[PDB]
Design a protein around this ligand. Structure first.
Ligand code: HEM
Ligand code: HEM
Ligand SMILES: NC(=[NH2+])NCCC[C@H](N)C(=O)O
Ligand SMILES: NC(=[NH2+])NCCC[C@H](N)C(=O)O
Ligand SMILES: C[As](C)(=O)[O-]
Ligand SMILES: C[As](C)(=O)[O-]
Ligand SMILES: [Zn+2]
Lengths: 416, 414
């Protein structure tokens, strides 16, 4: 058989081979001795900061590779324009120790990075991404304006649109552009006296950083945090998002009338902002991206995780379930109703959202498209399969090959 | 390098130093991870045209013997050195060797302990090992199997057991149980490409008919066994109904559930896996314990390629099957799993729900961290098919590797 990973779909009994993994130039965490596929942050999916510019040879090879990817995408591989661009990059680096991307190249790489994201189940939309070029940005104040513009365009009053805003890349001998917050919109996490946390336990450190930087905290469960934007070599500046910009959805249940009384809510825009966008060896340390939520992210993870809002027991008690015995499946029953409420509340408020069945079904179509288009698709099974009703979705029964392709969205150290 | 492992729910960290003992290779490489693949040729132990070279066999054997004597704390005693000599002498003259009963008992328990995809490993020390190496016919295999079943079932108070048939020998065919489990339901290809019964058993059902089985036509017809002695054609054996404990499915509050006629056997006995101890391979070594509710309620009954009853139940519940957003599938699955737990509980049959099972696995992980410095686990199999994040194991990072003794996959005898 073919000299590549054989992949099977147990529901359909169909087979495919992944030839695309042959293109991977960056090693993952696994070795033939042991699989480290379940680790969230292995030192293999992280790109550490740099106290020195990338060796002109490694950067060049990465640059040449990206340029080849670009021209191939536009079908001019080997052309004069191709050779000229490659020359311009080499010359540029040979003198400055770095280079710059053409506007069309940045748009190509940004879409490719999303396309290459193993942990994203919404990749069927990879072609539809609004790329806001913010490489002219020169201050934290301007970062805020760009971010506000991103939120307005992306939110679009409920009819969400995928977008990313690219701030200036990493320059040797100059500090980075960084958004300290993990997401543009996040709820505060207040550490209480008894030790507990009011709000989102995940955001405890950033909340305390905002306060250390002059933020006057509230004391609610759903307090939107201000941004901590950092321009090169300057301390981070605090900026408050205008409430009218931040669209939220109050959660209610279609039948359980009491669910509304819980006072639960969630913001409409998922905008990751602490990830590094890497293209052709160039590192864009500040490049917030956003799309729309898949219901389980809110109803299951955010609201039900033991280390997050942890409302499973509260909802169970309200449903009058036997919370004293595991075999009553109270957790399962409550989780189902919480997810249903998120779906129902978003549809009612006319805010874009996709449930886990629809999301996975479309990702299967994405896998099929990518099989023909690139001969494979890097996918992290643990992250693609929904946190609830796993085997009830088609992706569970689909084996997957995971590897790193560039351009890519990578994890980076906290600026503090 | 030793992998730093983290529990995202508790913030705790552990370093797996046990993976350093792995000598067998998995499917992953630094270029790409194949951890989600069910059957790589790596975990497989295919047939062979010649004897395992004395060097490799002798090294696996000595390692196992070393593991055994360390277990009884007699590591270094004269019994240890003499057992090592006995093994060397037998391999150098015969190209193979044999195990003592006590070693085979230690081995089988260690095989289970090392099974990455098993969430029931807290019970690893409690295993009844039936030595069936003094078997010379399929007929004998049948008697042994019937006794395993009679013991294991125990009127509903299930007990973990394993029956070990003769090891593979370079000079002949293997002892094999053709069935994937000692107890399974038939799958009859019904004209229009569909299947009556369990679709996962279509092939074996056909084989049984091929060998003279008079088939039935229900959805839950228990299949006869196809047992095979070396270099002989498999023989058909029908299991005595009184030995097959089955549980009729009903729901605690939905009176109409019982009307679905659903039911499932009580004993989960995998019989197609190869057991490897000290380089020796046992091609027929069925093992059983008890079910985890999701195996029946979610996988067996709801998988699209299995009984696929999700929609039927949803219709009975009068759910919105029009669209995915009504979460009709999730609601249906929850009730089915509940009907499974209620039914096994109402009957005399042992069963564990996924919340109880995973909590116990977390305890096992802790025990193993102190005992061996780690524990091979395959995240995709440990995390249940429904309500993944609602369980503690979902938030636990895991390292997956091959330790020996081990249960491995092997080619289908046909
Ligand atoms: C169009 C709607 C989209 C959907 C429904 C979707 C859904 C998801 C989901 C469910 C996850 C896992 C979340 C978690 O477990 O924390 C995820 C991860 C990811 N998505 Fe998407 N995504 C979408 C848009 C985007 C866009 C526009 C980008 C970038 C341009 C993107 C980049 C990624 C990346 C890099 C990750 C990995 C995050 C991490 O490693 O923590 N996604 N997405
Ligand atoms: C005591 C109760 C037990 C429980 C609750 C339990 C549960 C499980 C579960 C849920 C799986 C995954 C099955 C699947 O997804 O198809 C599994 C796999 C497995 N179990 Fe256990 N188990 C138990 C006993 C045993 C015993 C007695 C042995 C062996 C002596 C064992 C060996 C294994 C192995 C090797 C696998 C892999 C199966 C495969 O690859 O298809 N288990 N077990
Ligand atoms: N649909 C997305 N764009 N998701 C990005 C990750 C968001 C993260 N899972 C959250 O719940 O906040
Ligand atoms: N609990 C066990 N030992 N299970 C072994 C595998 C059983 C298999 N998953 C089934 O549904 O029949
Ligand atoms: C809110 As209580 C029922
Ligand atoms: C029980 As209804 C069909
Ligand atoms: Zn792996």
């Amino acid at each position: 058989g073919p000299k590549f990973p054989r992949v099977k779909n147990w529901e359909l009994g169909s087979i495919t081979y992944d030839t695309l993994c042959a293109q991977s130039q960056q090693d993952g965490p696994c070795t033939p001795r042991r699989c480290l596929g379940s680790l969230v942050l292995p030192r293999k999916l992280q790109t550490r900061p740099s106290p020195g510019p990338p060796p002109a040879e490694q950067l060049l090879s990465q640059a040449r590779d990206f340029i080849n990817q670009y021209y191939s995408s536009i079908k001019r591989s080997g052309s004069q324009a191709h050779e000229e661009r490659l020359q311009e990059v080499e010359a540029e680096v040979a003198s400055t120790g770095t280079y710059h991307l053409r506007e069309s190249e940045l748009v190509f790489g940004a879409k490719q990075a999303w396309r290459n994201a193993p942990r994203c189940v919404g990749r069927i939309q990879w072609g539809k991404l609004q790329v806001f070029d913010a490489r002219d940005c020169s201050s934290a104040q301007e970062m805020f304006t760009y971010i506000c513009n991103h939120i307005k365009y992306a939110t679009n009053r409920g009819n969400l649109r995928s977008a990313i805003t690219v701030f200036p890349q990493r320059a040797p001998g100059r500090g980075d552009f960084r958004i300290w917050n993990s997401q543009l919109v996040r709820y505060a996490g207040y550490r209480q006296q008894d030790g507990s946390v009011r709000g989102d336990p995940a955001n405890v450190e950033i909340t305390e950083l905002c306060i250390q930087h002059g933020w006057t905290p509230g004391n609610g469960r759903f307090d939107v945090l201000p941004l901590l934007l950092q321009a090169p070599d300057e301390a981070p500046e605090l900026f408050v998002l205008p409430p009218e910009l931040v669209l939220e959805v109050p959660l209610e249940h279609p039948t359980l009338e009491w669910f509304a009384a819980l006072g639960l809510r969630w913001y409409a825009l998922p905008a990751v902002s602490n990830m590094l966008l890497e293209i052709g060896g160039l590192e864009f340390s500040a490049a917030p991206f956003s799309g729309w939520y898949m219901s389980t992210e809110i109803g299951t993870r955010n609201l039900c995780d033991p280390h997050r809002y942890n409302i499973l027991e509260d909802v169970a008690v309200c449903m009058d379930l036997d919370t004293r015995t595991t075999s009553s499946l109270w957790k399962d029953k409550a989780a189902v109703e919480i997810n249903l409420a998120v779906l129902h509340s978003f549809q009612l408020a006319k805010v874009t959202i996709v449930d886990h069945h629809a999301a996975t079904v479309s990702f299967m179509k994405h896998l099929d498209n990518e099989q023909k288009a690139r001969g494979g698709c890097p996918a992290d099974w643990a992250w693609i399969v929904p946190p609830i009703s796993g085997s009830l979705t088609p992706v569970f029964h689909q084996e997957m090959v995971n590897y790193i392709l560039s351009p890519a969205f990578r994890y980076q150290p906290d600026p503090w």
